[PDB]
Every structure is written in C-alpha cells, then in structure tokens.
Coordinates of C-alpha atoms and ligand atoms in Angstrom, one line a residue:
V36 CA 80.3 94.0 144.0
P37 CA 83.0 96.5 143.5
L38 CA 83.2 97.9 140.0
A39 CA 86.1 97.4 137.6
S40 CA 87.6 94.8 140.0
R41 CA 88.7 91.2 139.7
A42 CA 85.4 90.1 141.3
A43 CA 83.4 92.2 138.9
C44 CA 85.2 90.5 136.1
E45 CA 84.7 86.9 137.3
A46 CA 81.0 87.7 138.0
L47 CA 80.4 88.1 134.2
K48 CA 80.7 84.3 133.7
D53 CA 72.9 88.0 137.0
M54 CA 74.7 89.7 134.1
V55 CA 71.9 90.5 131.6
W56 CA 73.0 90.2 128.1
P57 CA 71.2 92.0 125.2
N58 CA 71.0 88.6 123.3
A59 CA 69.6 85.9 125.5
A60 CA 71.7 83.3 123.7
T61 CA 75.0 84.8 124.9
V62 CA 77.3 82.3 126.5
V63 CA 80.4 83.4 128.4
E64 CA 83.2 80.9 128.2
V65 CA 86.0 82.9 129.7
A66 CA 86.0 85.8 132.3
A67 CA 89.6 86.0 133.5
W68 CA 91.7 88.7 135.1
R69 CA 95.0 89.6 133.3
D70 CA 98.1 91.2 134.8
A71 CA 99.7 94.1 133.0
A72 CA 102.1 93.0 130.1
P73 CA 105.2 95.0 129.3
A74 CA 105.9 96.5 126.0
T75 CA 107.7 94.4 123.5
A76 CA 109.5 95.4 120.3
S77 CA 106.3 95.0 118.3
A78 CA 103.6 95.8 120.8
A79 CA 102.8 98.5 123.3
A80 CA 102.4 97.5 127.0
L81 CA 98.9 96.2 127.9
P82 CA 97.4 97.4 131.1
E83 CA 95.8 95.2 133.7
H84 CA 92.3 94.1 132.6
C85 CA 89.4 91.8 132.5
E86 CA 89.2 89.4 129.4
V87 CA 85.7 88.1 128.6
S88 CA 85.3 85.7 125.7
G89 CA 82.3 83.6 124.5
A90 CA 79.7 83.2 121.8
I91 CA 76.3 84.4 120.7
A92 CA 73.5 82.4 119.0
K93 CA 75.0 78.9 118.8
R94 CA 73.1 77.0 116.3
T95 CA 73.2 74.4 113.4
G96 CA 73.0 75.7 109.9
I97 CA 71.0 74.3 107.1
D98 CA 74.3 72.7 105.9
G99 CA 74.5 70.7 109.1
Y100 CA 77.4 72.6 110.4
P101 CA 77.6 74.5 113.8
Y102 CA 77.7 78.3 113.8
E103 CA 78.1 80.8 116.5
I104 CA 79.1 84.4 116.8
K105 CA 82.4 84.4 118.8
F106 CA 83.5 87.6 120.6
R107 CA 86.4 88.6 122.8
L108 CA 86.4 91.6 125.0
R109 CA 89.1 93.3 127.2
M110 CA 88.1 95.9 129.8
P111 CA 91.1 97.6 131.5
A112 CA 90.9 98.2 135.2
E113 CA 92.1 101.8 134.5
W114 CA 89.6 102.9 131.7
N115 CA 89.5 106.1 129.8
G116 CA 85.7 105.9 129.2
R117 CA 85.9 104.9 125.4
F118 CA 84.7 101.8 123.7
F119 CA 86.6 100.3 120.8
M120 CA 85.9 97.6 118.2
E121 CA 88.4 96.4 115.6
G122 CA 87.3 95.2 112.2
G123 CA 87.8 91.9 110.5
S124 CA 89.8 90.8 107.3
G125 CA 89.6 88.4 104.5
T126 CA 86.3 86.3 104.9
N127 CA 86.7 86.7 108.6
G128 CA 86.3 83.3 110.5
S129 CA 89.0 83.9 113.1
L130 CA 89.1 85.5 116.6
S131 CA 92.1 87.8 117.3
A132 CA 93.6 88.7 120.7
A133 CA 91.1 91.6 120.7
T134 CA 93.5 94.1 122.0
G135 CA 92.1 96.7 119.5
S136 CA 94.3 96.9 116.5
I137 CA 94.3 100.5 115.0
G138 CA 95.9 99.4 111.8
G139 CA 98.4 101.5 110.0
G140 CA 101.3 99.4 111.1
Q141 CA 101.1 100.9 114.6
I142 CA 102.9 99.7 117.7
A143 CA 100.1 100.8 119.9
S144 CA 96.8 99.0 120.3
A145 CA 93.6 100.6 121.7
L146 CA 93.9 98.5 124.8
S147 CA 97.4 100.0 125.4
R148 CA 95.6 103.4 125.3
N149 CA 93.1 102.2 128.1
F150 CA 90.1 101.7 125.7
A151 CA 87.8 98.7 126.3
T152 CA 88.3 96.7 123.1
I153 CA 86.2 93.9 121.4
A154 CA 86.6 91.7 118.4
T155 CA 84.5 89.0 116.5
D156 CA 85.0 86.3 114.1
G157 CA 82.0 87.4 112.1
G158 CA 79.8 84.4 112.9
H159 CA 81.8 81.5 111.5
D160 CA 85.0 79.7 112.5
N161 CA 87.8 78.7 110.0
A162 CA 88.8 75.7 112.2
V163 CA 85.3 74.3 112.2
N164 CA 83.4 75.7 109.1
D165 CA 86.0 74.3 106.7
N166 CA 84.1 72.2 104.2
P167 CA 86.1 70.3 101.6
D168 CA 83.1 70.1 99.2
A169 CA 82.4 73.9 99.5
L170 CA 85.9 75.3 98.8
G171 CA 87.3 75.2 102.3
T172 CA 87.0 78.1 104.7
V173 CA 84.5 80.1 102.5
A174 CA 82.0 77.3 103.3
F175 CA 79.9 79.4 105.7
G176 CA 78.2 80.8 102.4
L177 CA 76.2 77.6 102.4
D178 CA 74.2 78.8 105.4
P179 CA 71.8 81.7 104.9
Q180 CA 72.0 83.0 108.4
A181 CA 75.7 82.7 108.4
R182 CA 75.8 85.0 105.4
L183 CA 73.6 87.6 107.2
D184 CA 76.0 87.2 110.3
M185 CA 79.1 87.9 108.0
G186 CA 77.4 90.8 106.4
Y187 CA 76.0 92.9 109.3
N188 CA 74.5 90.9 112.1
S189 CA 77.5 89.6 114.0
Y190 CA 79.0 93.0 114.3
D191 CA 75.7 94.3 115.5
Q192 CA 75.4 91.7 118.2
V193 CA 79.0 92.0 119.3
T194 CA 78.7 95.7 119.7
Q195 CA 75.6 95.4 121.8
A196 CA 77.1 92.7 124.0
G197 CA 80.3 94.6 124.5
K198 CA 78.7 97.8 125.5
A199 CA 76.4 96.0 128.0
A200 CA 79.5 94.3 129.6
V201 CA 81.2 97.7 129.8
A202 CA 78.2 99.3 131.5
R203 CA 77.9 96.5 134.0
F204 CA 81.7 96.2 134.7
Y205 CA 82.2 99.9 135.1
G206 CA 78.9 101.2 136.4
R207 CA 78.6 103.5 133.5
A208 CA 78.1 103.4 129.8
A209 CA 80.9 104.4 127.4
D210 CA 81.2 108.2 126.8
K211 CA 82.1 107.5 123.1
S212 CA 82.7 104.5 120.9
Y213 CA 85.2 104.0 118.1
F214 CA 85.5 101.5 115.4
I215 CA 88.7 100.9 113.1
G216 CA 88.9 98.4 110.3
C217 CA 90.7 98.0 107.1
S218 CA 89.7 95.8 104.0
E219 CA 86.9 93.6 105.0
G220 CA 87.1 95.7 108.3
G221 CA 86.7 98.8 106.2
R222 CA 83.5 97.5 104.6
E223 CA 82.3 96.8 108.1
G224 CA 83.0 100.4 109.1
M225 CA 81.1 101.8 106.2
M226 CA 78.3 99.4 106.9
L227 CA 78.0 100.7 110.5
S228 CA 77.8 104.2 109.4
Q229 CA 75.0 103.3 107.0
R230 CA 73.0 100.6 108.9
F231 CA 73.8 101.2 112.6
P232 CA 74.5 105.0 112.8
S233 CA 74.6 105.2 116.7
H234 CA 76.7 102.2 117.3
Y235 CA 80.0 104.2 116.9
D236 CA 80.8 107.9 117.2
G237 CA 84.0 107.6 115.3
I238 CA 84.8 105.3 112.3
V239 CA 88.0 104.6 110.5
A240 CA 87.4 102.6 107.3
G241 CA 90.6 101.8 105.3
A242 CA 90.6 100.3 101.9
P243 CA 87.0 99.4 102.3
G244 CA 85.4 96.6 100.3
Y245 CA 82.0 98.4 100.3
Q246 CA 81.2 96.5 97.0
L247 CA 82.9 93.2 97.9
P248 CA 80.4 91.0 95.9
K249 CA 81.8 92.7 92.8
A250 CA 85.4 91.7 93.4
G251 CA 85.1 88.3 91.9
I252 CA 83.6 90.0 88.8
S253 CA 86.8 92.1 88.5
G254 CA 88.7 88.9 89.3
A255 CA 87.2 86.9 86.5
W256 CA 87.7 90.1 84.3
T257 CA 91.4 90.5 85.1
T258 CA 92.0 86.8 84.8
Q259 CA 90.5 86.6 81.4
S260 CA 92.2 89.9 80.3
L261 CA 95.5 88.6 81.4
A262 CA 95.2 85.2 79.7
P263 CA 96.4 86.1 76.2
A264 CA 99.7 87.2 77.8
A265 CA 100.2 84.1 79.9
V266 CA 103.0 81.5 79.3
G267 CA 102.1 77.9 79.8
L268 CA 99.3 76.1 81.4
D269 CA 98.7 74.7 84.9
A270 CA 97.8 71.1 85.9
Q271 CA 94.2 71.4 84.6
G272 CA 95.0 73.4 81.4
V273 CA 94.4 76.9 82.7
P274 CA 96.8 79.6 81.5
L275 CA 99.5 80.5 84.0
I276 CA 98.3 84.1 84.7
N277 CA 101.3 84.6 87.0
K278 CA 103.6 84.1 84.0
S279 CA 102.0 87.1 82.2
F280 CA 104.5 89.5 83.8
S281 CA 107.8 89.0 85.4
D282 CA 108.7 91.1 88.5
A283 CA 111.3 92.8 86.2
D284 CA 108.4 93.4 83.7
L285 CA 106.2 95.0 86.4
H286 CA 109.0 97.0 87.7
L287 CA 109.7 98.3 84.1
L288 CA 106.0 99.3 84.0
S289 CA 106.2 101.2 87.4
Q290 CA 109.3 103.0 86.1
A291 CA 107.4 104.0 83.1
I292 CA 104.5 105.3 85.3
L293 CA 106.9 107.3 87.3
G294 CA 108.5 108.6 84.1
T295 CA 105.0 110.0 82.9
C296 CA 103.7 110.9 86.4
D297 CA 106.1 111.4 89.2
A298 CA 106.9 115.0 88.5
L299 CA 103.2 115.9 87.9
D300 CA 102.9 116.8 91.5
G301 CA 106.1 119.1 91.3
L302 CA 108.8 116.8 92.7
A303 CA 110.5 113.9 91.3
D304 CA 110.7 111.6 94.3
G305 CA 109.3 108.2 93.3
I306 CA 105.7 109.1 94.6
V307 CA 102.7 109.9 92.3
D308 CA 100.8 112.6 94.5
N309 CA 98.9 113.9 91.5
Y310 CA 96.9 110.7 90.9
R311 CA 94.2 112.5 88.8
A312 CA 96.8 114.0 86.5
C313 CA 98.6 110.6 86.2
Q314 CA 95.4 108.8 85.0
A315 CA 94.8 111.5 82.4
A316 CA 98.4 111.3 81.0
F317 CA 99.6 107.7 81.3
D318 CA 98.9 105.1 78.6
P319 CA 101.5 102.2 78.5
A320 CA 100.9 102.1 74.7
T321 CA 102.2 105.7 74.4
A322 CA 104.5 106.1 77.3
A323 CA 108.3 105.9 77.1
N324 CA 110.7 103.9 79.1
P325 CA 112.6 106.8 80.9
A326 CA 115.7 104.7 81.4
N327 CA 116.4 104.6 77.6
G328 CA 113.9 107.2 76.2
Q329 CA 112.4 104.6 73.8
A330 CA 108.7 103.5 73.9
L331 CA 107.7 101.2 76.7
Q332 CA 105.9 98.9 74.2
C333 CA 108.4 96.8 72.1
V334 CA 108.8 97.5 68.4
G335 CA 110.6 94.3 67.9
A336 CA 110.5 91.2 70.0
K337 CA 110.6 91.0 73.7
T338 CA 113.6 92.6 75.5
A339 CA 114.1 93.3 79.3
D340 CA 113.5 97.1 78.4
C341 CA 110.2 96.9 76.7
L342 CA 106.8 95.2 77.1
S343 CA 105.3 93.1 74.4
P344 CA 102.1 94.5 72.8
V345 CA 100.0 91.7 74.1
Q346 CA 101.3 92.5 77.6
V347 CA 100.3 96.1 77.1
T348 CA 96.9 95.1 75.7
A349 CA 96.4 92.7 78.6
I350 CA 97.2 95.1 81.5
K351 CA 95.2 98.1 79.9
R352 CA 92.2 95.9 79.6
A353 CA 92.4 94.5 83.2
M354 CA 92.9 98.1 84.6
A355 CA 89.8 99.4 82.7
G356 CA 87.5 97.2 84.7
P357 CA 84.7 94.8 83.6
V358 CA 81.7 95.4 81.3
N359 CA 78.9 93.4 79.9
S360 CA 77.9 93.0 76.3
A361 CA 75.9 96.2 76.5
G362 CA 79.2 98.0 77.6
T363 CA 77.9 98.8 81.1
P364 CA 80.7 98.9 83.7
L365 CA 80.3 96.2 86.4
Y366 CA 82.6 97.6 88.9
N367 CA 85.2 100.4 88.2
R368 CA 88.6 101.2 86.7
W369 CA 91.8 101.1 88.5
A370 CA 94.5 103.7 88.8
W371 CA 98.0 103.5 87.3
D372 CA 100.5 103.9 90.2
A373 CA 104.1 103.2 90.9
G374 CA 103.2 100.8 93.8
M375 CA 102.2 98.2 91.2
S376 CA 105.8 97.2 91.7
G377 CA 108.8 98.6 93.7
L378 CA 112.4 97.6 94.5
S379 CA 113.9 97.8 98.0
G380 CA 117.4 96.4 97.9
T381 CA 117.1 93.2 95.8
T382 CA 113.4 92.5 96.7
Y383 CA 110.6 93.2 94.4
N384 CA 107.3 94.3 95.9
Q385 CA 104.7 91.4 95.7
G386 CA 101.9 93.5 97.3
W387 CA 100.2 94.3 94.1
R388 CA 100.8 91.4 91.8
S389 CA 99.6 88.7 94.2
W390 CA 96.0 89.7 93.6
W391 CA 95.5 89.4 89.9
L392 CA 98.7 87.5 88.8
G393 CA 100.3 85.6 91.6
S394 CA 103.9 84.6 92.1
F395 CA 105.9 84.3 89.0
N396 CA 108.1 81.4 90.3
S397 CA 105.4 78.8 90.4
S398 CA 104.2 76.2 88.0
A399 CA 100.6 76.7 89.2
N400 CA 98.2 79.6 89.5
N401 CA 98.0 81.3 92.8
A402 CA 96.6 84.7 92.3
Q403 CA 93.9 85.8 94.8
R404 CA 91.5 86.4 92.0
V405 CA 92.4 83.4 89.7
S406 CA 92.3 80.4 92.1
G407 CA 92.7 81.9 95.6
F408 CA 90.3 82.8 98.3
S409 CA 88.7 85.8 96.4
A410 CA 87.5 83.7 93.5
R411 CA 86.5 81.0 96.0
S412 CA 84.5 83.6 98.1
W413 CA 82.6 84.9 95.1
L414 CA 81.5 81.3 94.1
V415 CA 80.2 80.3 97.5
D416 CA 79.7 83.4 99.6
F417 CA 78.4 85.9 97.0
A418 CA 76.8 84.1 94.3
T419 CA 73.1 83.2 95.0
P420 CA 72.5 80.3 94.9
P421 CA 76.1 79.4 95.9
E422 CA 78.3 77.4 93.5
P423 CA 80.4 74.8 95.4
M424 CA 82.9 72.9 93.5
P425 CA 86.3 71.2 94.0
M426 CA 89.3 73.5 94.5
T427 CA 90.9 72.6 91.2
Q428 CA 87.9 73.9 89.2
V429 CA 88.0 77.5 90.5
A430 CA 90.5 78.8 88.1
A431 CA 88.6 77.4 85.1
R432 CA 85.4 78.8 86.4
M433 CA 86.9 82.2 86.3
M434 CA 88.1 81.8 82.7
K435 CA 84.6 80.7 81.7
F436 CA 82.9 83.6 83.6
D437 CA 80.0 85.0 81.7
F438 CA 79.7 88.8 82.3
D439 CA 76.1 88.9 81.1
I440 CA 74.9 86.0 83.2
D441 CA 77.2 85.6 86.3
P442 CA 77.2 89.3 87.6
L443 CA 73.4 89.0 88.2
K444 CA 73.9 86.4 91.0
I445 CA 75.3 89.0 93.5
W446 CA 71.7 90.6 93.2
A447 CA 69.6 87.4 93.2
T448 CA 67.8 85.7 95.9
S449 CA 67.0 81.9 95.7
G450 CA 65.4 79.5 98.0
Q451 CA 66.3 80.0 101.6
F452 CA 68.8 82.7 100.6
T453 CA 66.3 85.5 101.0
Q454 CA 68.9 88.3 100.8
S455 CA 71.3 89.0 98.0
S456 CA 74.9 89.3 98.8
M457 CA 74.7 93.0 97.8
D458 CA 71.9 93.2 100.3
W459 CA 73.8 91.9 103.3
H460 CA 77.4 92.5 102.3
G461 CA 77.2 95.7 100.3
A462 CA 77.6 99.1 102.0
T463 CA 76.8 101.6 99.2
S464 CA 74.4 103.9 100.9
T465 CA 75.3 107.7 100.9
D466 CA 72.6 108.3 103.6
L467 CA 74.8 109.2 106.5
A468 CA 72.7 111.9 107.9
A469 CA 71.7 110.2 111.0
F470 CA 75.4 109.3 111.6
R471 CA 76.6 112.9 110.9
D472 CA 73.8 114.6 112.9
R473 CA 74.5 112.7 116.1
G474 CA 78.2 113.8 116.0
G475 CA 79.6 110.9 114.0
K476 CA 82.9 111.3 112.3
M477 CA 84.4 109.0 109.6
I478 CA 87.9 108.8 108.2
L479 CA 88.4 106.8 105.0
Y480 CA 91.7 105.9 103.6
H481 CA 92.9 103.8 100.6
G482 CA 96.1 103.0 99.0
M483 CA 96.5 104.0 95.4
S484 CA 98.2 100.8 94.4
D485 CA 95.5 98.5 96.0
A486 CA 94.7 95.6 93.7
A487 CA 92.0 94.2 96.0
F488 CA 89.6 97.1 96.1
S489 CA 90.1 100.1 93.7
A490 CA 91.0 103.4 95.4
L491 CA 89.2 105.1 92.6
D492 CA 85.9 103.4 93.5
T493 CA 86.3 104.6 97.0
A494 CA 86.9 108.1 95.5
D495 CA 83.7 107.7 93.6
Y496 CA 81.7 106.9 96.7
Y497 CA 83.2 109.9 98.4
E498 CA 82.1 112.1 95.4
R499 CA 78.6 110.7 95.6
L500 CA 78.6 111.1 99.3
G501 CA 79.5 114.8 98.9
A502 CA 76.8 115.4 96.3
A503 CA 74.2 113.7 98.5
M504 CA 75.1 115.6 101.6
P505 CA 76.6 119.0 100.9
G506 CA 79.3 120.0 103.4
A507 CA 80.2 116.3 104.0
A508 CA 83.8 117.2 104.7
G509 CA 82.7 118.5 108.0
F510 CA 82.1 114.9 109.1
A511 CA 83.7 112.6 106.6
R512 CA 87.0 112.8 104.8
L513 CA 89.0 110.5 102.5
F514 CA 92.9 110.1 102.6
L515 CA 94.3 108.4 99.5
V516 CA 97.9 107.1 99.8
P517 CA 100.2 107.1 96.8
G518 CA 102.2 103.9 96.3
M519 CA 100.5 101.9 99.0
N520 CA 99.1 98.4 98.4
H521 CA 96.1 96.9 100.2
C522 CA 95.9 98.3 103.8
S523 CA 99.8 98.5 103.9
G524 CA 103.1 98.0 102.1
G525 CA 104.6 99.3 98.8
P526 CA 106.5 102.5 98.0
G527 CA 104.5 105.0 100.0
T528 CA 103.9 106.4 103.5
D529 CA 101.7 103.4 104.6
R530 CA 102.1 103.9 108.4
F531 CA 100.0 106.2 110.4
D532 CA 98.1 106.7 113.7
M533 CA 94.5 107.1 112.7
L534 CA 93.0 106.8 116.1
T535 CA 94.4 110.0 117.5
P536 CA 93.0 112.3 114.8
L537 CA 89.6 110.3 114.9
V538 CA 89.3 111.0 118.7
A539 CA 90.1 114.7 118.2
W540 CA 87.6 115.0 115.5
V541 CA 84.7 113.3 117.5
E542 CA 85.4 114.9 120.8
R543 CA 86.9 118.3 120.1
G544 CA 85.4 118.9 116.7
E545 CA 88.9 119.1 115.2
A546 CA 88.7 118.0 111.6
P547 CA 91.9 116.5 110.1
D548 CA 93.3 118.8 107.6
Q549 CA 96.1 116.4 107.2
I550 CA 97.3 113.1 108.8
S551 CA 100.9 112.4 109.4
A552 CA 102.3 109.2 107.8
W553 CA 105.6 107.5 107.3
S554 CA 106.8 104.8 105.1
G555 CA 107.3 101.2 106.5
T556 CA 109.8 100.4 103.7
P557 CA 111.7 103.6 103.0
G558 CA 114.2 101.4 101.0
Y559 CA 111.8 101.7 98.0
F560 CA 113.2 105.3 97.8
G561 CA 116.8 104.6 98.8
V562 CA 116.4 106.5 102.1
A563 CA 116.3 105.6 105.8
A564 CA 112.9 107.3 106.4
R565 CA 110.3 109.2 104.7
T566 CA 107.4 111.1 106.4
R567 CA 104.7 112.8 104.3
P568 CA 101.3 114.3 105.0
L569 CA 98.2 112.5 104.0
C570 CA 95.7 115.0 102.6
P571 CA 92.0 115.2 102.6
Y572 CA 90.4 114.4 99.1
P573 CA 90.7 116.0 96.8
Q574 CA 94.0 117.7 98.0
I575 CA 97.3 116.1 97.5
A576 CA 100.7 116.5 99.3
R577 CA 102.8 119.4 97.8
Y578 CA 106.4 120.1 98.4
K579 CA 107.2 123.6 99.8
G580 CA 110.2 124.0 97.5
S581 CA 113.0 123.8 100.0
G582 CA 114.1 121.2 102.6
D583 CA 114.7 117.6 102.8
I584 CA 112.1 115.9 100.6
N585 CA 111.8 113.0 103.1
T586 CA 110.6 115.3 105.9
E587 CA 107.0 115.9 106.4
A588 CA 107.4 119.5 107.6
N589 CA 108.4 120.6 104.0
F590 CA 105.1 119.5 102.5
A591 CA 101.6 120.9 102.6
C592 CA 98.1 119.7 101.5
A593 CA 96.8 121.6 98.5
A594 CA 95.5 121.4 95.0
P595 CA 97.5 119.8 92.2
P596 CA 100.0 122.3 90.7
Ligands
CA1 CA1 106.3 113.0 92.8
CL2 CL1 98.7 96.7 111.2
CL3 CL1 115.2 120.4 106.3

C-alpha cells in the first residue's frame, strides 16, 4: 500500500496500464549507487522494465516496444525521458541522459526517468537479407513505432506508473534528445504537444529521410577525387582527402573566417559571414600566403582542383535535373578537421568519407548505416540487398527517381517515411500556449545533419509564429561535430536552463559551455557562451580568451 516504497515498486509487476498490451518483466528496488569518475550518484529507486504491443511483423520477425523506467524514492515531482540515437533498437540504462557530455543524469537529480528502444531490438531484428539491424523497415507497424508511436506509448506508460507509484501525477515533464533523439523531440513538440513541458532537441534529424539523398550526393560528388577502388570496384571515397588535406582545408577556413567575429582564436563564431566569404577555390593557405588550390601538382600545402571541385559540390547539397534543392547546403567550419596533440579529428570525415587508412569504404553515407537505413527504412517500398551492394547503389542513385521514394506509399506501407519520421511542422502553437519551451542546439561542423537546415527551420518557425523566441530558441555551436566533439565548446548542461524556462519563465539569453577537447586550441580549458540565434559570442576586448566571462552574446561585428 504505502506510496514510493519497495512494496509499491514490486506491486507494479491491479496496476492499470494505458495500453492493455503492456507486460512488466522487471519491477525491482535498487539501492543508491555512489558517484563514479564518469557518472553522478544514483539515488535509491524503483526500476520497472518491460514491453508494449508484443507482436509478429509481416516479415515474420517479433516486435515490441521496450521501455525501462526508474522512479526514485525521493522524487522532485518531475518526469524525464531521454531520446534515442542512430536507428534506435537498443535499450539504455534509462537513468536520463541529458547529453552535452555531462556527468549528471536526470535520475541523479531525482527525476523519474524512462527510455525506449523505439519498437525494435538490434539483437533480434537483425536480418542478414535486409541489411542487418535496419531490418525493422520491412515491417510497416515497426516503421510507425520508430517514427512516433513508440515514444507516445512509452510516455503514457511512464506517466501512468509515476502517478500510481507516487500517488500524484508529474508536475512537469521534460524530454532531452540529440541526433535521432533530437528528431524525436521536435516530433513531440509538433505531434504530441502536451506530452512534455520542456524539450531539448540537439542536432535534430527532423528531415532524416533526406539524409540518404545527401549521402548519395556527397558520395557521387567525392568520387572524382577518390584514389583506387574497393573490393567491388567502387571508388575509395575515404581516399579523396587525407587527414592532412582536411586539416589544411580547415586552416584555410580559419584564415578566411576566424577573425570575422573579432577574435583570432580558432573558432568561427560569425558563421554567416564565413559562408559569404569562404570559397576554397579563391581562399589562401594562411601558412604560406599562396592559394589553397594547387597551381602545379599536389603538394602537402595545397589542394588539387579536383579535390576543391569535389568538396564544394558535396557542401552545396543535392539537386535534381530541374535544379531543385533536395535537402540543404552545409556550412564551412573549422571543425571539419582539428588537431589535438598528434590526433586528427575524425568527427566530421567519418560521415561522408570514412577512415583514410583502410582499403575499403566505411563512411556512414557510402556503405555504413545511413546508406543502409535509407534503403530499407526510408525508401518505400524498401530496397533490401546484400551489404556489399550498398556502396554501388549510392553511386547509381538517381536524383530524379530515387528521392520520390521518401514521399511514396506502397502496399501495406500506408505512410511515407516523411509522414512517420519527418518532423517539419512549424505549428507549435498548442505547445507554446500550454507553457512549452524548446531549446534547439546544433554543432556547426555536423556532417550528419546540416546546422544550416536547423537554422532554416528556426527561420520558418519565427515567421509562422511571431515572437517565437519567447518559447523556442536555437543555440548553434561553432566547431562542434554531431552532438559532440570537435574544436568547440561541446559540453553544456541543457537541463538546468530548460527547467528555469519552463517553471520560472526565465528564457536562456545564453547557455554556458566548455570544450571537451581544449587541446584543439592548445589550452587546458575553454569556456564560452552559447548564444540564441541569430546572436553569436563576442569577445569583450580584454581578459583571457578562454574564459566565458570575457564574452557576451550579440550581433556579428
Ligand atoms: Ca574567432
Ligand atoms: Cl553525452
Ligand atoms: Cl581574466
């Protein structure tokens, strides 16, 4: 009987679930866990885990929506869900990750926390004939679960357990996710406006079905600059640029752009002015004052004209024969490379190129999971094929025929992948008018999703909803790669300003951040403010350039 107790916990295994097909597998009491070097202390709590809507898909495979929920004995009254990543399919510890490379989890701050696998299981839904762990795309309902339904079901189940376990409903609910988790957050704001009061959506894949389009585009754009072929005769896209070549490119970007914010410090805060000024075909190598593009043959100090032509085309984004942009363009930024000690940053090049030191293609968008996901999860009908065919399929991508498939329905696939996965709506009025607050962030050197495309969504949001900065703000991060890493201030506590905005009405005029790898700048630490779009961080003119107190958020100089 007694609330928030070990007995209340075990009783959850007369509990009425919102979905009748909810099956509790574990309801176990957990002692407090001390802090570790990489994780804050976890309070005493009830762990509930189980699944919703066990079934068999039309592919003969089993499917269910897994969840894991943790409810602390000492509870602050708030509910918290963390978002997913990749193509989901895994169930985390569900202590409420807040991203930003943070030590603390939401459970360590006495939230009740929940996580899902998105409706499929990478250990079970791994089909060798359907490109491995993306195979859930062969089941229409599993697609719908991945797009929106799993997070809806798990939110309802979690809130129901909270109300039963504590004798009262959550005062406020919070959702934080990055990447695929960021798409989920935007989706919740659009499709389920009252599920969460506060949403953090980092590097959000809100047009994820278009990623494979960009992937085929960057693959074909980079092929003229590749050197060699892989085991099935596909150009080695990873050989198009060495790490030294990419570092040369970012040094050229810094040469053109670093000081456009007023401070030569290795960070391009004035990203708009950089885009307008930088052209690798006209820019100079600052180390030697010569043109970045070779006049003669290839040296370590220049880039071949084919290299320059290739990267420019990849960064421009895909079009069809009519010239219509199919996704968006990408921003030149220093975080495309980076050097800390003797280690080159791999956090940008792994997406479109892959590791240089390999005899095979391994880029996410050439032969990796992104290309695989587009083929089976997002094309309708799905296009399963052997793993060794994926790279060739990207080289033969037809930008007039293939991009239509993310909008198509076929057979039992009664929704398009943009229908169930896309989160492009700017109608956040219901969300805003019940008190919802949303923090978006995106690293400028993200090669998975374009930071400029997030910016264009924010522009459209501001136009559809005048005064949108009162409930939704965007924080771009110079130098940061996808969700983390790179030469920028990629670490931040987003949960604290989110709670302040939701509950005290305090909008974040800036968000403190620090660099996880300050070696990129040759310093022991760098702290900087993140600034709400379209402001940027501006140095005050005096003081240590690595200290956040010497910076302020303002317009570009
Ligand atoms: Ca700068
Ligand atoms: Cl993290
Ligand atoms: Cl100082």
